[PDB]
């Protein structure tokens, strides 16, 4: 049993809810929240800007030190950093950004990072301002992630379309 409430069950391991991932993280304090990161960990907008704002920019300060030491992530890659006030840990995952021309096949590699964690609160990778089709992102998630993933979908309209169209 875990703390997640109000989710619709899609599969054995994937759950979905219409929710602001920031408000959800603040309520649940999950072990792992996933950030929709870029390779520079520049948390300007979308999910990353919202998560970082909720940490009062502490996420960005920590991220800048990580990049100064390690250099940029790979598209499809990840790193584990602090969850600050939102979670124990933040798994920063880089899905391909279609609005930069990145290979959508890298979305499966991105979701494979989730399998290193037993339970996660996450957004749909490469959705929103990363430009991918969220229906596709949900299918890759279901077909890739084997650990227990609680997906937060901010837009109610999109949430209802994802549920209604789910195979
Ligand atoms: O997927 C998004 O575009 C998004 C952007 C910001 C915050 C969020 C989101 O979904 C969960 O909560």
UniProtKB/Swiss-Prot annotation:
Membrane topology: Multi-pass membrane protein
Subcellular compartments: Host endoplasmic reticulum membrane
Reactions this protein catalyses: Thiol-dependent hydrolysis of ester, thioester, amide, peptide and isopeptide bonds formed by the C-terminal Gly of ubiquitin (a 76-residue protein attached to proteins as an intracellular targeting signal)
Record domain Macro: where: 1-167
Mechanisms controlling activity: Inhibited in vitro by GRL-0617.
Subunit structure as annotated in this protein's UniProt entry: May form homohexamers. Interacts with N protein.
Described function: Responsible for the cleavages located at the N-terminus of the replicase polyprotein. Participates together with nsp4 in the assembly of virally-induced cytoplasmic double-membrane vesicles necessary for viral replication. Antagonizes innate immune induction of type I interferon by blocking the phosphorylation, dimerization and subsequent nuclear translocation of host IRF3. Also prevents host NF-kappa-B signaling. In addition, PL-PRO possesses a deubiquitinating/deISGylating activity and processes both 'Lys-48'- and 'Lys-63'-linked polyubiquitin chains from cellular substrates.
Protein name: Papain-like protease nsp3
Organism: Severe acute respiratory syndrome coronavirus 2 (2019-nCoV)
High-level lineage: Viruses, Riboviria, Orthornavirae, Pisuviricota, Pisoniviricetes
Record gene name: rep
């Amino acid at each position: 049993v875990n703390s997640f409430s109000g989710y619709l069950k899609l599969t054995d391991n994937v759950y979905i809810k219409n929710a602001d991932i920031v408000e959800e993280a603040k309520k649940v304090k999950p072990t792992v929240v996933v950030n929709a990161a870029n390779v520079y960990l520049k948390h300007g907008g979308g999910v990353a800007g919202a998560l970082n704002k909720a940490t009062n920019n502490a996420m960005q300060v920590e991220s800048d030190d990580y990049i100064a030491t390690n250099g940029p992530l790979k598209v499809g890659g990840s790193c584990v950093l602090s969850g600050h006030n939102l979670a124990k840990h933040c798994l920063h995952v880089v899905g391909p950004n279609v609005n930069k021309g990145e290979d959508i096949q890298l979305l499966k590699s991105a979701y494979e990072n989730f399998n290193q964690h037993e339970v996660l609160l996450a957004p749909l990778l490469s959705a929103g301002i990363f430009g991918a089709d969220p229906i596709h992102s949900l299918r890759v998630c279901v077909d890739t992630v084997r650990t227990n993933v609680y997906l937060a979908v901010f837009d109610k309209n999109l949430y209802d379309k994802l549920v209604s169209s789910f195979l």
